[PDB]
């Protein structure tokens, strides 16, 4: 089976992709993808990638069972938009667990390896800082409570400067205490043109209702 | 001053229960609309929608695996006691036998209904036994009211105009002592034993009075508040004899400034020794600037910590005392283990209008949202 395009807004590119080369990525970035052993896009990536890299950017709700496929898809989206020159978070990724966060973190670190000045912060339980300091990293990943804390309670992150926002495993996400409202309150904080990207294996009424609050004007896709 | 990561305390959420329909507009006035009888196992919640009395059991429901944590239980069985005017304040006597409801009414003014809690025990009248009329103005708005912890019949009432009265209720309301609005009282708290009364003033001091209202002690406005930026006492909790949590906020009444929670430790041999004032700044992160500032403080002796909740914030934070018992830390909790108020259907923040702690079932914290949802949490230390 293919991807299903369930809602596609205008100005959102209509083409499938069969090579990472036709995505016209930066060389440093493409080498990164190649180095992890991604020599051609996966089924999901065929459509998700064009949608996520289109100019100007488009929000996406994407049903797919989680796996390296979808993650690398959204990891690539994030890296694509990063500007290592500017030393501050530009990309924000929300994992439902500390363990998932570290795991996805590896993927970022892996795929960004040929990015020399790029560094990645973890907004998780454990990592501490003083309130004076803004963080230097350009990509941040963690669990929503701590991310929320970071953004508004601890002044670590200027939310108004985030251009890509990933919300991973949203089913698992809103099944855990307080995460639903944490995520909503983080997204609220981001600017109009920040790119909203949601991923969930399953989409029950609650989850889908949630997803729509979080991701305006979305592209909706589902695999198999 | 110091944060520390607590991985040994969860606020474990229970099912949210709706008690009132969502308001058309966000309530803005100082309110305290939730009460718990730990003696008779009752919760008392008030609003514009009348007064509701629940068996605490009915409100404490745990969600099973599979249960959408974000689901709001539709309604729970309780008694409805219709009220002519909107209640802004509820409070019990210490023996749980008297409930006070502060109403604001455009024709009459503000007035306190006193109920004998035992009445709510019957089927189909349920009249209060005394009425006290505090004021005819928005000035008569009750901003602080606490009953004496050891003296059932006695209660201190604190008005928007900045005046106070101490009252005795038995067969009728007796006004024992008042103080005029020029005094500028902004808050009240009884001493642990109920032997003295603390009042927070517009000038950022706290003055300890005997119930007769004879002045016993003055707690200075901390030295680190520049005249350039004056503060008033917003809320005060008298925790131990020489130990206070005094909340300070902008004197001018500005909402944009977020109030500081301060642990004050007082000397015994005063002359000469100074008082230690330990600032926590904003322990409950302010996200709203529409609502009147109000800090709901509660002391848990067993755990030697305070539960703080703010009108302007969606979170309950903890101010715990270190084992030395001179210093306090704020705790940081796992995202999955916090007490935070829900987001509304309209995508808005819901903020607290009442906080209480039940022991009759773990201890349980309960919050009543500005959205009329009740949010209960087990506490596991």
CA distances from B193 to A128, B87, B149, B196, B200 (A): 41, 29, 7, 8, 19
Q: Could you say which DSSP state residue A134 is in?
A: P
Nearest to A178 among B71, B336, B349 (CB): B336
Up-side HSE of residue B104: CA atoms within 13 Å toward CB? Answer: 16
- State the Cα–Cα distance between residues B206 and B210, nearest whole angstrom: 13
Q: How far is B24 from chain A (nearest CA, A)?
A: 21
Query: How crowded is residue B195: how many other Cβ atoms within 10 Å of its Cβ?
Result: 16
B335·A145 Cβ contact <8 A:
yes
Output b/e per residue, B207-225; b: 16+ Cβ within 10 A: bbbebebeeeeebebbeeb
Q: How many domains does chain A have?
A: 1
Question: Do the beta carbons of residue B198 and residue B184 sit within 8 Å?
Answer: no
Q: What is the largest CA-CA distance in chain A?
A: 52
The radius of gyration of chain A's CA atoms, rounded to the nearest angstrom, is 16
- State the Cα–Cα distance between residues B342 and B344, nearest whole angstrom: 6
Query: How crowded is residue B199: how many other Cβ atoms within 10 Å of its Cβ?
Result: 25
Q: What is the 3-state secondary structure (H, E, C) of chain B?
A: CCEEECCCCEEEECCEEECCCCCCCCCCCCCECEEEECCCCEEEEECCCCEEEEEHHHHCCCCCCCCCCCCEECCCCCEEECCCCCEEEEEECCCCCEEEEEEEECCCEEEEEEEEHHHHHCCCCCCCCEEEEEECCHHHCEEEEEECCCCCCEEEEEECCCCEEEEEECCCEEEEEEECHHHCEEEEEECCCCCCEEEEECCCCEEEECCCCCEEEEECCCCCCCCCCCEEEEEEEEEECCEEEEEEEECCCCCCCCCEEEEEECCCCCCCCCCEEEECCCCCCECCCCCCCCEEEEEECCCCEEEEEECCECEEEEEEECCCCCCEEEEECCHHHCCECCECCCCCECCEEEEEEECCCCCEEEEEECCCEEEEEEEEC
B340·A144 Cβ contact <8 A:
no
Q: How far is B34 from chain A (nearest CA, A)?
A: 22
- State the Cα–Cα distance between residues B291 and B341, nearest whole angstrom: 15
- State the Cα–Cα distance between residues A192 and A195, nearest whole angstrom: 9
Note down the domain range covering B289: 1-381
Question: Do the beta carbons of residue B54 and residue B36 sit within 8 Å?
Answer: no
CA distances from B244 to A106, B266, B297 (A): 48, 8, 11
Residues of A in Cβ contact (< 8 Å) with B336: 145, 176-179
Question: Do the beta carbons of residue B238 and residue B192 sit within 8 Å?
Answer: yes
Structure tokens at B267: 């000397």
CA angle B215, B217, B219 (to 5 degrees): 130
Structure tokens at B80: 């409805």
Question: Do the beta carbons of residue B287 and residue B269 sit within 8 Å?
Answer: no
CA A150 to mean position of chain CA atoms? 17
* B248 strand-pairing partners: B233, B260
Tell me whether residue A104 is annotated as binding: no
Nearest to B285 among A125, A153, A175 (CB): A153
- State the Cα–Cα distance between residues B176 and B154, nearest whole angstrom: 9
A154 touching B (Cβ < 8 Å):
no
Main-chain phi, psi angles of B190, to 5 degrees: -75, 150
B70·A143 Cβ contact <8 A:
no
Scanning the structure block, which residue is given the tokens 């109000």?
B294
- State the Cα–Cα distance between residues B55 and B181, nearest whole angstrom: 39
B338 touching A (Cβ < 8 Å):
yes
A213·B347 Cβ contact <8 A:
yes
- State the Cα–Cα distance between residues B310 and B45, nearest whole angstrom: 18
Note down the domain range covering A198: 1-224
Question: Do the beta carbons of residue A48 and residue A5 sit within 8 Å?
Answer: no
Structure tokens at A174: 């809103």
Main-chain phi, psi angles of A48, to 5 degrees: -60, -45
B347·A188 Cβ contact <8 A:
yes
What technique solved it?
Answer: X-ray
**CA quadruple B338, B342, B343, B345: dihedral positive or negative?**
positive
Output b/e per residue, B127-159; b: 16+ Cβ within 10 A: ebebebebbeeeebbbbbbbbbbebbbbbbbbb
- State the Cα–Cα distance between residues B301 and A103, nearest whole angstrom: 42
Shortest CA distance to B22 belongs to which of B355, B342, B287? Answer: B342
B68 touching A (Cβ < 8 Å):
yes
- State the Cα–Cα distance between residues B63 and B70, nearest whole angstrom: 10
For residue A191, the domain's CATH number is 3.40.50.300
- State the Cα–Cα distance between residues B178 and B166, nearest whole angstrom: 6
Shortest CA distance to B246 belongs to which of B300, B295, B179? Answer: B295
CA distances from A213 to A7, A85, B1, B195 (A): 16, 33, 37, 53
Residues of B in Cβ contact (< 8 Å) with A175: 68-69
Q: Which helix (H) or strand (E) holds A33?
A: helix A27-35
Tell me whether residue A136 is annotated as binding: no
- State the Cα–Cα distance between residues A137 and A147, nearest whole angstrom: 14
Shortest CA distance to A74 belongs to which of A193, A191, A186, A197? Answer: A197
- State the Cα–Cα distance between residues A124 and A108, nearest whole angstrom: 16
Q: How many domains does chain B have?
A: 1
Q: How far is A63 from chain B (nearest CA, A)?
A: 20
Cα-based torsion angle of the residue sequence B240, B241, B245, B246 in order, rounded to the nearest 10 degrees: 160
Strand bridging mode B164-169 / B154-159: antiparallel
| Interacting residues of B66 by C-beta distance below 8 A, sequence separation 6+ | none
- State the Cα–Cα distance between residues B312 and A61, nearest whole angstrom: 33
Cα distance from N-terminal residue to C-terminal residue, chain A: 5
Up-side HSE of residue B255: CA atoms within 13 Å toward CB? Answer: 15
Structure tokens at A24: 């016209």
Up-side HSE of residue A157: CA atoms within 13 Å toward CB? Answer: 29
A191 touching B (Cβ < 8 Å):
no
Question: Do the beta carbons of residue B190 and residue B148 sit within 8 Å?
Answer: yes
What angle do the packed helices A68-81 and A27-35 form, to 10 degrees?
160
Mutate to test the interface with A, among B69, B312, B335 (most CBs of A within 10 A): B335
Shortest CA distance to B12 belongs to which of B368, B364, B367? Answer: B364
Q: How far is B348 from chain A (nearest CA, A)?
A: 9
Strand bridging mode B3-5 / B328-332: parallel
- State the Cα–Cα distance between residues A158 and A154, nearest whole angstrom: 10
Q: How far is A122 from chain B (nearest CA, A)?
A: 14
- State the Cα–Cα distance between residues B109 and B137, nearest whole angstrom: 6
- State the Cα–Cα distance between residues B175 and B132, nearest whole angstrom: 10
Shortest CA distance to B264 belongs to which of B234, B235, B242? Answer: B242
């Amino acid at each position: 089976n293919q991807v299903e395009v369930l809602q596609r807004d205008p100005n959102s590119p209509l083409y499938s992709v069969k090579s990472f080369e036709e995505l016209r990525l930066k060389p440093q970035l493409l080498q990164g993808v190649y180095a992890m052993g991604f020599n051609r896009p996966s089924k999901i990536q065929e459509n998700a990638l064009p949608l996520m890299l289109a100019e100007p950017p488009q929000n996406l709700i994407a049903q797919s069972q989680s796996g390296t496929g979808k993650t690398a898809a959204f990891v690539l989206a994030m890296l694509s938009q990063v500007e290592p020159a500017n030393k501050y978070p530009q990309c924000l990724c929300l994992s439902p667990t500390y363990e998932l966060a570290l795991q996805t973190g590896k993927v970022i670190e892996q795929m960004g390896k040929f990015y020399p000045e790029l560094k990645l912060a973890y907004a998780v339980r454990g990592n501490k800082l003083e309130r004076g300091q803004k963080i230097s990293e350009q990509i941040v990943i963690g669990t929503p409570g701590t991310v929320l804390d970071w953004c508004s309670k601890l002044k670590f992150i200027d939310p108004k400067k985030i251009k890509v926002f990933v919300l991973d495993e949203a089913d698992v996400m809103i099944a855990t205490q307080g995460h639903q409202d944490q995520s909503i309150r983080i997204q609220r904080m981001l600017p109009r043109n920040c790119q909203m990207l949601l991923f969930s294996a399953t989409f029950e009424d609650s989850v889908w209702k949630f997803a729509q609050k979080v991701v305006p004007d979305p592209n909706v896709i589902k695999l198999k | 001053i110091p944060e520390r990561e607590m991985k040994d305390f969860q606020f474990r959420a229970l099912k949210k229960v709706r008690i009132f329909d969502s308001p058309e507009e966000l309530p803005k006035e100082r309110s305290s609309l939730l009460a718990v009888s730990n003696k008779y196992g009752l919760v008392f919640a008030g609003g514009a929608s009348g007064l509701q009395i629940f068996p605490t059991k009915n409100l404490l429901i745990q969600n099973k695996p599979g249960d959408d944590p974000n689901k709001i239980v539709d309604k729970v069985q309780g008694l409805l006691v219709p009220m002519k005017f909107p209640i802004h304040h509820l409070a019990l006597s210490c023996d749980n036998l008297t409930l006070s409801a502060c109403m604001m009414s455009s024709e009459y003014g503000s007035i306190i209904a006193f109920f004998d809690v035992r009445t709510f025990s019957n089927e189909a009248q349920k009249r209060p036994f005394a009425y006290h009329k505090l004021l005819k103005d928005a000035g008569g708005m009750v901003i602080d009211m606490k009953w004496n912890p050891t003296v059932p019949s006695m209660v201190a009432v604190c008005l928007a105009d900045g005046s106070i009265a101490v009252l005795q209720v038995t067969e009728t309301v007796k006004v024992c002592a008042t103080l005029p609005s020029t005094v500028a009282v902004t808050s009240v708290c009884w001493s642990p034993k109920g032997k003295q009364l603390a009042v927070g003033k517009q000038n950022g001091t706290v003055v300890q009075y005997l119930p007769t209202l004879q002045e016993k002690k003055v707690i200075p406005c901390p030295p680190f508040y520049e005249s350039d930026h004056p503060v008033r006492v917003l809320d005060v909790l008298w925790i131990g004899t020489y130990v206070f949590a005094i909340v300070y906020a902008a004197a001018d009444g500005t909402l944009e400034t977020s109030p500081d929670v301060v642990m004050a430790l007082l000397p015994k041999k005063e002359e000469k020794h100074p008082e230690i004032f330990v600032n926590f700044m904003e322990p409950c992160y302010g996200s709203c600037t529409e609502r009147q500032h109000h800090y709901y403080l509660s002391y848990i002796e067993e755990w030697d910590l305070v539960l703080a909740a703010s009108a302007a914030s969606t979170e309950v934070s903890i101010l715990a005392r270190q084992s030395d018992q001179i210093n306090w830390e704020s705790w940081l909790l796992e995202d999955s283990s916090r007490a935070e108020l829900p987001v509304t259907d309209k995508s808005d923040d819901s903020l607290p209008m009442g906080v209480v702690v039940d022991y009759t079932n773990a201890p349980v914290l309960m919050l009543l949202s500005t959205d009329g949802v009740l949010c209960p949490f087990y506490m596991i230390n």
